[PDB]
Design an enzyme around this catalytic site. Structure first.
Site, PDB file in Angstrom:
ATOM      1  N   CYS A   1      45.198  45.034  37.436  1.00 34.32           N
ATOM      2  CA  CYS A   1      43.879  44.420  37.585  1.00 34.32           C
ATOM      3  C   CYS A   1      43.851  43.182  38.494  1.00 34.32           C
ATOM      4  O   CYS A   1      42.948  43.046  39.307  1.00 34.32           O
ATOM      5  CB  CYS A   1      43.349  44.108  36.184  1.00 34.32           C
ATOM      6  SG  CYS A   1      41.731  43.312  36.299  1.00 34.32           S
TER       7      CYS A   1
ATOM      8  N   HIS B   1      36.199  36.595  33.459  1.00 32.67           N
ATOM      9  CA  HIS B   1      36.658  37.971  33.363  1.00 32.67           C
ATOM     10  C   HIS B   1      35.690  38.758  32.494  1.00 32.67           C
ATOM     11  O   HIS B   1      34.946  39.589  33.008  1.00 32.67           O
ATOM     12  CB  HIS B   1      38.112  38.022  32.890  1.00 32.67           C
ATOM     13  CG  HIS B   1      38.781  39.334  33.166  1.00 32.67           C
ATOM     14  ND1 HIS B   1      38.991  39.871  34.433  1.00 32.67           N
ATOM     15  CD2 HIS B   1      39.398  40.120  32.246  1.00 32.67           C
ATOM     16  CE1 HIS B   1      39.726  40.975  34.243  1.00 32.67           C
ATOM     17  NE2 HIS B   1      39.987  41.147  32.943  1.00 32.67           N
TER      18      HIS B   1
ATOM     19  N   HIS C   1      34.371  47.446  35.137  1.00 31.72           N
ATOM     20  CA  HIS C   1      35.586  46.656  35.350  1.00 31.72           C
ATOM     21  C   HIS C   1      36.033  46.590  36.811  1.00 31.72           C
ATOM     22  O   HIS C   1      36.453  45.535  37.262  1.00 31.72           O
ATOM     23  CB  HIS C   1      36.662  47.233  34.421  1.00 31.72           C
ATOM     24  CG  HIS C   1      38.009  46.571  34.379  1.00 31.72           C
ATOM     25  ND1 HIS C   1      39.115  47.134  33.752  1.00 31.72           N
ATOM     26  CD2 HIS C   1      38.366  45.362  34.891  1.00 31.72           C
ATOM     27  CE1 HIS C   1      40.120  46.265  33.913  1.00 31.72           C
ATOM     28  NE2 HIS C   1      39.698  45.198  34.605  1.00 31.72           N
TER      29      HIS C   1
END
Lengths: 917, 753, 97, 48
Positions: free
Chosen positions: A148, A283, A323
């Site tokens: 990520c 986040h 995401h």
């Protein structure tokens, strides 16, 4: 497909998570039934021909390489950098990418061609290499993976490379495409996904994560170097840090402490203080525990130091788009950059209330549950990113405003013409740009749009130019281009790479041919150029104020206000013609038109020689005024001239064979169908009558055009030899052809007083000169048509040359267009369209022009994928009973039979009993 | 369409036969190869085979089975009786160099072209001939390294080597054909890297063959190989091409429309016109530009600029040839000919309104001109320009003038019958001033080979033939209105019966057979299939050349029956004829005979207002007339004329349409397929008349009020169409204009170059 | 590090207790993550790929990190294992060996 | 580190890029090319 599209989605409070993609070859059964995720639609479509790729290699390339490649071009275009100017630069590349498994789609072994491209098509380290190869970049070119965080790691390394001075630019970002379903199947199998697929960032309604795709590239430079180059700045990245959760006892949170360290490290790297940050793009991935730990780490860092009345404002774009995995930090930057430009912080979607897993009770941090204004002012606006991962590599960035966007202090002006310039790699993409651009010209300043287009975009093979003064005229021209319908405001064509260009210079007096309604209007049009083009005004005065002293200041009035004398064989007319020819040559070379040969007709040969670099400007005016006084003696002399509609060999034979010819001779041979005769007015008129008796047309009478006696020759040679000996001749930069010979001029011939008198001891052989230009490869041919319509005889002598049906472009520069600048801009537009690399800056020089944003290139996409699209999913059926297996269809069998193979791992699954082990 | 090669089927049986044994010698007998194994591009195939041992010693029986068609069932696609262990001696070292002695060598490239003119093409692994000799009733060949996987060593090379024997067995024949049976095949070992074939047609309708090693050892033999029982099985059901709509679309030359130079001193230009002043003025313009030229006009006009007077108006080429022969006796060299037509100015000049007779006059004159001149100086490779005016559909300048149509037919006849000559058709606006002659000859000389160009305003257009899908499901939804009569006219009984069946299948209650045979032939079969849905059926025995019998068709529908709503003039045969075999008097007679029928009907029905009350009025023409074809001058002229005539009424707002169809499948003669064989080799495939009517008929409500151009509806492969016939230089109607200025890099990862 | 394709050795499907470990077992980004987890290290962990130069690039970035003062120590290197034959087959097929 | 980029093979793109990266590595370390004794080259065995 842009920051503004993301802003329109985000600022309207939409979301983009949806159903599974069709048309990817996914064999997936019920295993994804009811799953939602954020896909890129049409990711399987690409334009191989734009990038110069063979379509079989474009099918072999991982979609992630394709999106990086496509997105990089667009990043240069919005930086306002021509990608062709980026070739050979010290630009470094840092791309966050992961192996996507794309070759594993294949149901069958690949064809032997596509097989050889699968390696570099799918290596991760090949992705940054392919970018630097395609764009011809010379800096380091590396790919990075940390799951990520891979994008934020790429940005950190690019910032550290720029600060260490490794490179002039850096190009940093990443891509993530789910070419295979397997990551969705796994996150669904392990119940990690929120059941509706929404990342409910920091909400009490938090449920799980949600997967999505993306790609993005930023172009980066040191702020001082960006400013002194005059580039646009979208935002400033001010400081960055990475760390690792590592491992610990787990009664202390490793992630809690690690997030608190990385924030302080990034603030210290940026040399900023935590009280000066206004907002965090957190986040907030939507996991129930992780969102609580993140908010806690913000409360213990930023939440301790707030100014009075200034809570930290928290949100996350992952609520709008899911995401996005490896590119999460790019999505956060694009939101913050657009928030800075729009002076607003967007809402966070799907917040029912703030998550209970953190103590909001201090009031020092709040969620953006409603959008808030964020105006430029005394307090410098700043914001931070976080990005996190389970393998523990965290990162943080600090962003800041651009420096003050100081206005142009823009002047008032009359509506001088604007040339919009468009080009594309195919005709359809040209008309697509005309449609896209019409939505901009109807709102932005036309001069600013025009000034942007010639400099912030590359030049391709298919070309167009649109001319106008009003916004409505430019819009009408673009509409006609988009409709593929012809209108006089625009020019269309295809670039021939061949450079070979030549330039034609006239003398004054040939307007005696009778087209004075054009040959006086050309000079009046040339007056109009003084108002429109600074290079002309300077160049004309640098002849005039320098060399009017040879004649007295009366010639300055004639130059400023031209009239019939400028088309007539006189000292003043010859001087004016030389001045205006010189000024036009200096104008065309300021537009970067460079002649590969020059030809001059009569006294225009001095201008052609000057343009070929063979003289100083002062030598030119001295020689022109000498030839001017000689020309007066000839034109005031007792003789005459005529044109006859008969060719040289006809006229010369009929003349030479007859009597009543006394003293009449051929003066000029410029076009196949006519020739000019001069001498005694009696014989000249009687030669014309003789040709009318043969039924030919004649134009008659006119003044003499040749020396009528050797007395005049000896007087002219005495005048010339004294002056010619004083001229500072030098050898030409490019071949100079003479109408005395019809041939190139040698060093001794250039220096000969006889040669300069041979303009009066003819014939003039313009036909042979133009014919030689075409044998010697000249494709395009430019007339300084101030008198004699010089391009006309050029066309009529050029076009009938010989077999091959060659290209031939004739351009008249002081032409017949009504606003004086439009004639010249149309002629230049036609040369540029045919392939000349014209420098348009002279149209925009001396005006309030500013750079502005423009649309990006319209790719003409087609399907490029390893497998055909699936049929309708109704095909699926239940699995075979595990030890009964597959039913056979042996054709003549009397009753059905079945078989199964059990591999060793299956055997232990079915044989569920053991006897004695 | 892809097919399994006959040599591969014949190997597949042998591979099954030898599977159970190490033995190197084999025999197969009583072999059958029924049907064709085929697979539409991008489809899976399942195969099955069985060694159904009879127990009679050697006699294993081998079968091979291809899969069900869709949801169907397995079918036999070959079968053979095995006889292992051949156990008898054979001749040795039979000299391969003695084989070609009686025989003439052929180029392998012409061998594979001959097979391509039998519909058959091969991938490189089956292009295994290396040298071929042929003579009388036999052939021999050298076969190359047939390097199949397990072929250089292993038996799989027999697939290719046996396919080479089939290639030679087909080569001696004519018409498309494929193997059906083999009486014996006998084999020993896999083939060597080089082998020699001999093939002989000595038997009645069957071939025998021998394969030898490079040393002359007997490797295999074949007896009783037969192809004839599958010569000329229907290529229509086999061909890959779908039903589509084909249109001649004018594209503007927006890019690259700059004329460029003219050829200079390489000859001179003949300029012929109906107007002596035009020919003069264009000679003046060419003289200004230094291009030598000659002005010509018909003997109908004076020497108004010293112009040559040509005996055109006589239908004879030979007096015209003698007229140019005098110019060759002056020493004239010709770069090209320009023919300029007056346009609609013949109407005020004559006072007449006779479009068919005007076409007959134009065509007769222009044939005598073009033939007479080709007979004299075609050896110089002259360029030809035919300048029409107002011929072009799909453009500005009002409706096209049908009297121009002979010029487009004559142009395409030159394109296909004299393909060595570069030539062009230019269509001007009939009412604007014509462009400068330099613009014409410049813009024309952009073209190697041939093309059609048109000018409107200052703008240049080029015609391209292009293709789009055809929704036949519109015809499934088209219910013909029940309160109405429909006409079927002019066709033969085969087309009429199929049209009548389609009308019945679409709910037509009332019909009239307006055929000449209709009320005199045994049309009781047509009545029987019609009355499967038609309630009211009537017949006329009309002569369509007669205005009185056409007036009888106009007395029908006025006779109180259910009112008229559709009319269909069916396809008709037209006589063959090239430019050679033909003269202007013959052309006028044949064109008038071809057109009078459909012209007089369409005229009379429009004059009495049955047109426009009609919802669908259709005229038949061929799709082949869009690019045109060799040897069909009059048929092309008639199709062009009816296309223009249909548009003239369509732009007057009427629902008249010219349909340019492929061959109707029901019109393919079972007795002699040769017309359909000729089309199939040329890549034109027959289709069901009812499917084409379904795809066409409801469409006139959509408008397409200009941009449709010349339009048709057929199954065609234009790449076969272009490569059939013969043509060295490009033709921009079928083919992309040219290459242009770009080139490509070595690409990423390459250390090379 | 470069993706080796190791799980593609399997003919059968894996047992579920293997299947749950294949992700972090084979992700290239996880290769540097495991080291910093196992040794409990707190500095940044990065996996890099540039074909044959991947090691010298990894070492270059570690030298910059130490000079910038980002960390106290740095730990730099790489690995390459032919777990599948396919790269030898490619170089042999193209006669590069 | 550098790329060799992309251009015409006739000017040896890899050759020029190798000359640049050597000079850059020396300039980073502040050393001079005379003060180096040996080089452990790539020398992979490809003929050119």
């Amino acid at each position: 497909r842009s920051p503004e599209d993301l802003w329109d989605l985000v600022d309207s409070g939409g979301d983009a998570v949806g159903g599974l993609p069709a048309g990817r070859g996914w064999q997936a059964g019920s295993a994804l039934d009811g799953v939602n995720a954020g896909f890129i639609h049409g990711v399987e479509e690409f334009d191989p021909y734009f990038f110069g790729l063979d379509p079989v290699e474009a099918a072999a390339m991982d979609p992630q390489q394709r999106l990086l490649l496509e997105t990089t071009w667009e990043a240069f275009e919005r930086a306002g950098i021509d990608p062709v100017a980026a070739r050979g630069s010290r630009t470094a590349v840092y791309a966050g990418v992961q192996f996507g498994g794309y070759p594993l789609l294949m149901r069958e072994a690949p064809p032997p061609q596509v097989l050889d491209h699968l390696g570099l098509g799918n290596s991760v380290g090949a992705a940054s290499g392919r970018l630097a190869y395609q764009f011809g970049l010379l800096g380091g070119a590396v790919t990075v993976d940390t799951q990520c965080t891979s994008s934020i790691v790429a940005l950190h390394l690019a910032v550290k490379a720029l600060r260490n001075g490794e490179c002039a630019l850096a190009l940093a970002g990443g891509a993530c495409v789910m070419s295979l379903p397997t990551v969705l199947m796994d996150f669904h199998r392990r119940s990690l996904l929120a059941p509706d697929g929404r990342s409910k960032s920091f909400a009490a309604a938090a449920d799980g994560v949600s997967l999505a795709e993306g790609a993005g590239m930023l172009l980066l430079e040191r702020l001082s170097d960006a400013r002194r180059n005059g580039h646009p700045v979208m935002a400033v990245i001010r400081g960055t840090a990475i760390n690792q959760d590592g491992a610990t006892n787990g009664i202390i949170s490793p992630s809690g402490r690690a997030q608190e360290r990385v924030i302080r490290a990034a603030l210290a790297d940026g040399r900023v203080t935590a009280d000066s940050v206004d907002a965090v793009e957190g986040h907030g991935v939507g996991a129930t525990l992780g969102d609580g730990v993140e908010v806690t780490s913000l409360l213990s860092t930023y939440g301790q130091e707030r100014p009075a009345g200034r809570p930290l404002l928290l949100g996350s774009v992952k609520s709008n788009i899911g995401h996005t995995q490896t590119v999460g930090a790019v999505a956060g930057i694009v939101k913050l950059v657009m928030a800075l430009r729009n002076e607003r912080l967007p809402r966070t979607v799907h917040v029912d209330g703030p998550t209970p897993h953190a103590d909001w009770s201090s009031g020092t941090v709040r969620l953006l549950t409603e959008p808030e204004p964020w105006r430029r002012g005394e307090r410098v606006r700043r914001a931070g990113l976080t990005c996190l991962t389970l393998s523990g590599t965290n990162g943080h960035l600090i962003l800041e405003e651009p420096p003050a966007d100081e206005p142009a202090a823009r002047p008032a002006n009359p509506e001088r013409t604007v040339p919009l310039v468009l080009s594309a790699k195919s005709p359809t993409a040209l008309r697509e740009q005309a449609e896209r651009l019409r939505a901009t010209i109807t709102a932005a300043e036309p001069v600013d749009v025009g000034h942007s287009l010639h400099t912030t975009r590359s030049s391709f093979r298919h070309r167009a130019v649109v001319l106008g003064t009003g916004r409505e005229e430019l819009a009408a021209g673009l509409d006609a281009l988009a409709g593929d319908r012809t209108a006089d405001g625009l020019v269309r064509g295809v670039a021939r790479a061949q450079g070979q260009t030549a330039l034609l210079f006239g003398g004054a007096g040939d307007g005696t041919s009778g087209d004075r309604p054009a040959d006086a209007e050309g000079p009046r049009t040339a007056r109009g150029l003084y108002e429109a083009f600074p290079a002309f005004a300077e160049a004309l005065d640098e002849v005039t104020e320098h060399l009017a002293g040879l004649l007295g200041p009366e010639v300055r009035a004639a130059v400023r206000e031209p009239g019939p004398a400028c088309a007539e064989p006189t000292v003043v007319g010859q001087a004016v013609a030389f001045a205006l020819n010189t000024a036009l040559h200096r104008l065309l070379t300021a537009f970067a038109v460079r002649p590969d040969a020059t030809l001059g007709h009569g006294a225009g040969e001095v201008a052609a020689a000057y343009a070929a670099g063979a003289l100083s400007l002062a030598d030119g005016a001295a020689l022109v005024t000498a030839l001017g006084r000689i020309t007066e003696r000839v034109a005031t002399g007792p003789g005459a001239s005529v044109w006859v509609r008969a060719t040289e060999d006809e006229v010369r034979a009929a003349l030479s064979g007859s009597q009543e010819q006394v003293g009449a001779a051929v003066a000029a041979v410029d076009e196949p169908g006519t020739t000019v005769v001069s001498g005694d007015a009696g014989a000249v008129a009687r030669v014309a009558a003789h040709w009318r008796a043969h039924g030919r047309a004649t134009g008659a009478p006119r003044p003499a055009r040749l020396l009528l006696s050797p007395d005049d020759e000896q007087a002219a040679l005495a005048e010339l030899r004294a002056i010619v000996a004083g001229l500072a001749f030098r050898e030409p930069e490019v071949p100079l052809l003479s109408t005395v010979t019809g041939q190139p001029v040698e060093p001794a011939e250039l220096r000969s007083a006889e040669h300069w008198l041979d303009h009066l001891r003819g014939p003039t052989r313009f036909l042979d000169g133009v014919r030689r230009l075409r044998t010697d490869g000249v494709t395009r041919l430019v007339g300084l048509d101030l008198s004699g319509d010089l391009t006309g005889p050029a066309g009529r002598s050029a076009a009938g040359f010989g077999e091959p049906g060659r290209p031939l472009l004739l351009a008249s520069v002081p032409g017949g267009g009504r606003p004086p600048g439009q004639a010249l801009l149309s002629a230049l537009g036609e040369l540029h369209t045919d392939g000349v690399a014209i420098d348009w800056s002279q149209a925009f020089e001396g005006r309030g022009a500013r750079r502005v944003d423009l649309p990006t290139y319209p790719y003409q996409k087609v399907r490029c994928w390893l497998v055909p699209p699936e049929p309708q999913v109704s095909v699926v059926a239940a699995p075979p009973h595990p030890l009964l297996g597959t039913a056979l269809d042996l054709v003549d069998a009397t009753g059905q039979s079945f078989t199964q193979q059990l591999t060793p791992g299956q055997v232990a699954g079915v044989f569920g009993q053991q006897l004695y082990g | 369409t892809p097919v399994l090669p006959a040599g591969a089927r014949l190997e597949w049986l042998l591979a099954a036969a030898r599977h159970g044994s190490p033995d190197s010698a084999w025999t197969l007998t009583g072999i059958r190869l029924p049907g064709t194994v085929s697979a539409a591009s991008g489809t899976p195939v399942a195969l099955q085979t069985s060694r159904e041992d009879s127990g009679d010693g050697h006699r294993v029986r081998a079968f091979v089975k291809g899969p069900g068609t869709g949801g169907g069932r397995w079918a036999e696609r070959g079968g053979a009786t095995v006889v292992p262990a051949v156990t008898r001696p054979a001749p040795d070292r039979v000299d391969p160099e003695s084989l070609p002695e009686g025989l003439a060598e052929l180029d392998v490239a012409e061998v594979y072209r001959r097979l391509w003119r039998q519909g058959s093409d091969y991938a490189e692994p089956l292009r295994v001939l290396r040298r071929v000799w042929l003579g009388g009733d036999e052939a021999v060949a050298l076969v190359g390294t047939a390097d199949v996987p397990t072929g250089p060593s292993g038996w799989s090379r027999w697939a290719a080597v046996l396919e080479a024997a089939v290639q030679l067995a087909a080569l001696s024949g004519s018409g498309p054909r494929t193997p059906v049976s083999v009486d014996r095949l006998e084999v020993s070992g896999p083939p060597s890297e080089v082998v020699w074939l001999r093939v002989r047609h000595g038997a009645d309708g069957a071939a025998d063959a021998v394969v030898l090693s490079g040393e002359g050892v007997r490797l295999a033999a074949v007896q009783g190989l037969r192809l004839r029982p599958m010569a000329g099985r229907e290529p229509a059901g086999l061909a890959e091409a779908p039903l589509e709509r084909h249109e001649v679309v004018w594209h503007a030359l927006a890019e690259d429309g700059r004329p460029g130079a003219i050829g200079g001193g390489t000859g001179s230009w003949l300029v012929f016109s109906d107007d002596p002043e035009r020919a003069a003025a264009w000679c003046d313009e060419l003289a200004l530009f230094g291009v030598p030229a000659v002005a010509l006009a018909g003997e109908d006009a004076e020497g108004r600029d010293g112009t040559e007077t040509v005996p055109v108006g006589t239908g004879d080429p030979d007096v015209v040839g003698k007229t140019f022969a005098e110019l060759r006796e002056r020493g004239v060299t010709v770069a090209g000919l320009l023919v300029h037509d007056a346009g609609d100015a013949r109407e005020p000049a004559s006072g007449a309104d006779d479009p068919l007779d005007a076409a007959c006059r134009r065509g007769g004159r222009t044939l005598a001109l073009v033939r007479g001149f080709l007979q004299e100086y075609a050896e110089q490779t002259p360029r030809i320009v035919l300048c029409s005016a107002g011929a072009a559909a799909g453009l500005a300048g009002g409706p096209p003038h049908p009297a121009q149509a002979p010029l487009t037919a004559l142009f395409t006849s030159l394109v296909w019958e004299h393909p060595e000559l570069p030539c062009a058709q230019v269509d001007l606006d009939p009412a604007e001033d014509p462009p400068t002659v330099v613009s014409l000859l410049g813009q024309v000389m952009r073209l190697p080979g041939a093309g059609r160009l048109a000018v409107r305003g200052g703008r240049w257009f080029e015609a391209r033939l292009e293709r789009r899908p055809a929704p036949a499901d519109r015809g499934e939804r088209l219910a013909l209105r029940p309160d109405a009569t429909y006409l079927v006219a002019g066709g033969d009984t085969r087309h009429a019966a199929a049209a009548l069946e389609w009308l019945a299948a679409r709910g037509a209650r009332s019909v009239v057979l307006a055929g000449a045979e209709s009320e005199r032939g045994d049309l009781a079969g047509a009545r029987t299939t019609g009355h499967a849905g038609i309630e009211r059926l009537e017949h006329v025995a009309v002569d369509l050349s007669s205005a009185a019998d056409v007036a009888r068709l106009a007395e029908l529908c006025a006779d109180g029956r259910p009112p008229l709503r559709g009319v269909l003039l069916l396809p008709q045969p037209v006589a063959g004829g090239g430019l050679d075999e033909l003269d202007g008097a013959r052309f006028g007679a044949e064109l008038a005979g071809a057109l009078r029928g459909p012209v007089e009907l369409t005229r009379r029905f429009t004059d009495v207002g049955l047109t426009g009350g009609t919802d669908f009025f259709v005229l038949s023409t061929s799709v082949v007339s869009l690019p045109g074809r060799a040897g069909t001058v009059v048929g092309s002229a008639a199709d062009a004329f009816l296309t223009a005539l249909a548009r003239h009424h369509r732009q007057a707002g009427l629902p008249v349409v010219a349909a340019a169809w492929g061959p109707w499948l029901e019109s393919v003669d079972e007795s002699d397929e040769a017309p359909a064989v000729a089309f199939a080799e040329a890549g034109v495939y027959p289709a069901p008349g009812g499917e084409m009517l379904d795809a066409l008929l409801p469409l006139p409500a959509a408008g397409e009020a200009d941009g449709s151009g010349e339009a048709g509806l057929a199954r065609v492969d234009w790449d076969r169409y272009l490569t059939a016939g013969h043509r060295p230089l490009p033709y921009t109607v079928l083919e992309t204009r040219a290459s242009y200025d770009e080139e490509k890099a070595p690409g990423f990862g390459q250390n090379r170059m």
